[PDB]
Design a protein around this ligand. Sequence first.
Ligand SMILES: CC(=O)N1c2ccc(-c3cc[nH]n3)cc2[C@H](Nc2ccccc2Cl)C[C@@H]1C
Length: 115
Amino acid sequence: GSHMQDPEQLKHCNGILKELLSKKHAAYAWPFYKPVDASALGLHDYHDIIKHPMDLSTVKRKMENRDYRDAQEFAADVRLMFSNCYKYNPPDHDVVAMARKLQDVFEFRYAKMPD
Ligand SMILES: CC(=O)N1c2ccc(-c3cc[nH]n3)cc2[C@H](Nc2ccccc2Cl)C[C@@H]1C
């Protein structure tokens, strides 16, 4: 059920999203900008292992389309994006180090949600 605070919380989520897409974090955010193109990367098992792909451009489209009804729904997609990375890639892969750094950006700012 919609709460009076959902619009303000979604503004906080949009601020986080803008930050994740900003030049400040681009050195480690870039793998997450667009859907994994498994065929182009030669990762022909990706869609057998990952049931629900997610990436920042999809989160952005969903935000722009008013798909997210609350902050927790937004957070679930961001965390799904990171979880897919941790599931598919070896834990010592460069992309996993990037995911951990970007997830730190996300989690610490998400924790500051007005409530
Ligand atoms: C998000 C994610 O999990 N992945 C992902 C997605 C997109 C891209 C991408 C986009 C444009 N060029 N490459 C690359 C990767 C990862 N590779 C990778 C990443 C950083 C350094 C070195 C390497 Cl090898 C594989 C993995 C499946």
